[PDB]
Design a protein around this ligand. Structure first.
Ligand SMILES: CC(C)C[C@H](N)C(=O)O
Ligand code: NA
Ligand code: NA
Length: 502
């Protein structure tokens, strides 16, 4: 079985896994919608009571399974808990990362395309009407992804966007086809530092932004100014936890698959903690210091929160480039922005496809080449639904990247620390650790977290899920199909094993 060649490569591959679109896109909007500082508090708490412990847990399950040659949840869940239902539940560790991968890779392709257009210097030139700076860029995005002008909820992507999607796919493939150490690690070692540099540069340049409506400092204040009256609101907590999961790549079965290539004796404690910490540094310090500060600078707090409430793509692909077009070399600034987003995205997508590739390799004994190619075929094909059908992406994102990850986090936590046993789980997590997990975190894992997530999920299913266009079903149907498909594969897998044992 393959293993991470180096320590640093492992760390940067993990951080590369976690740090991505969720940082510079999802987060700014999550904090903006939820009131800035008000959103932060629960966030922080969620990071302490959920993100860290679950990170450790996933590292542990990953390494544990990998030692025996299994990097995916369908098998690992079975090893930890011997049941058919353990496999059936483990399927989610494929379905989730695949479904999310479908639209994720697409958005990534968007960032690539925009990077190219901002690089070549083909960008909308705004003619002081506040919307008039935005309108051209809105038309730009809509023209790129082909928003549904008609009654029908149909999208008409540009040829260029489609080609850029093909190219993006090919990039992902070229990276994943070289393996864990050569393909993913080597790339992480470059993309990560590059990303960091770009991010810092952009944060500075943004901190230099000022208009009659405010300064980046205003945005920073809004973001970091605590509100203690918003904590009684369940929604803010649900958003905070969801954001934690998404940004830390927890519940996607990706962290597990990566951890499965960690040598049995290597440290999963200091490493995992380091990945988490890096991701959070990129999350709050970098991602939060660009979009929000800029928007608040130009349009002020109120309009900033309005724009964020509107959409994540509003802030990322419209507001920010529009704000840059008002500055010298703002076009090149836009190019830096979208290039950054592109690298982050890539480093994440490879990570979400790796689980499927790893199932094909481990369980069905497919060569790396074939595994990769087929995974890419499935993703590329399924992507068409997200492409031509409006709100399909939203559906996939909510069911897989939002609910699915929380539910699956709870599931894996219950399987590892409850059914598999708490003491054995703890011992497994701490084994080989350069440092040991603080004693308190035992209880946090065994009691606090599962309760927190259970209650959270209940409230979520009651008050929220009820809060759509029929086409959504077209998506749901399809994704449900995928699940069955995966199940079937699992089935086939468990059959091969038998014939192999006989
Ligand atoms: C679903 C995950 C791949 C998301 C990734 N950790 C990000 O924040 O961009
Ligand atoms: Na992240
Ligand atoms: Na990434």
């Amino acid at each position: 079985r393959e293993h991470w060649a180096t320590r640093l490569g492992l760390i940067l591959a993990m951080a590369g896994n976690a740090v991505g679109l969720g940082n510079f896109l999802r987060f700014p909007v999550q904090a903006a919608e939820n009131g800035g500082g008000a959103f932060m508090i629960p966030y922080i708490i969620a990071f302490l009571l959920v993100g860290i412990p679950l990170m450790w847990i996933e590292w542990a399950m990953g390494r544990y399974g990998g030692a025996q040659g299994h990097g995916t949840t369908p098998a690992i869940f079975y090893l930890l808990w011997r049941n058919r239902f353990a496999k059936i539940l483990g399927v989610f560790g494929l379905w989730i990362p695949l479904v999310v991968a479908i639209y994720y890779v697409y958005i990534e392709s968007w960032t690539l395309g925009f990077a190219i257009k901002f690089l070549v210097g083909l960008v909308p030139e705004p003619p002081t009407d506040p919307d008039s700076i935005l309108r051209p860029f809105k038309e730009f995005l809509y023209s790129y992804i082909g928003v549904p002008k008609g009654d029908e909820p149909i999208l008409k992507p540009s040829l260029f966007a489609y080609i850029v999607f093909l190219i993006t796919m090919f990039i992902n493939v070229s990276i994943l086809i070289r393996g864990i150490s050569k393909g993913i690690e080597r790339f992480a070692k470059i993309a990560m530092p590059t990303l960091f540099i770009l991010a810092v540069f952009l944060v500075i340049r943004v901190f230099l932004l000022e208009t009659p409506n405010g300064t980046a400092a205003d945005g920073l204040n809004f973001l970091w100014t605590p509100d203690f009256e918003k904590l009684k609101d369940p929604g803010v907590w649900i958003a905070a936890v969801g954001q934690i999961f998404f940004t830390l790549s927890l519940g996607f079965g990706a962290i597990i698959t990566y951890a499965s290539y960690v040598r049995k004796d290597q440290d999963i404690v200091l490493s995992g903690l380091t990945a988490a910490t890096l991701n959070e540094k990129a999350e709050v310090i970098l991602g939060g210091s660009i979009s929000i500060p800029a928007a608040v600078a130009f349009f002020g707090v109120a309009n900033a929160v309005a724009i964020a409430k509107a959409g994540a793509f509003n802030l990322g692909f419209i507001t920010l480039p529009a704000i840059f077009s008002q500055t010298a070399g703002g076009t090149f600034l836009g190019f830096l922005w979208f290039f950054l987003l592109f690298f982050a995205g890539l480093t994440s997508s490879i990570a979400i496809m790796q689980p499927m590739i790893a199932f094909l390799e481990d369980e069905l004994k497919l060569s790396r080449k074939h595994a990769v190619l087929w995974t890419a075929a499935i993703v590329f094909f399924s992507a068409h639904l997200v492409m031509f059908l409006n709100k399909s992406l939203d559906e996939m994102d909510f069911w897989a990247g939002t609910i699915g990850v929380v539910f699956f986090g709870l599931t894996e936590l219950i399987i590892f620390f409850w059914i598999f046993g708490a003491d054995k789980a703890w011992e497994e997590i701490n084994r080989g650790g350069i440092i040991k997990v603080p004693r308190i975190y035992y209880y946090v894992m065994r009691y606090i977290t599962p309760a927190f997530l259970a209650v959270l999920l209940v409230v979520w299913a009651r008050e929220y899920i009820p809060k759509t266009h029929w086409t959504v079903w077209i998506t749901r149907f399809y994704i449900i199909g995928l699940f069955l498909f995966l199940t079937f594969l699992v089935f086939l897998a468990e059959r091969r094993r038998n014939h192999e044992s006989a």
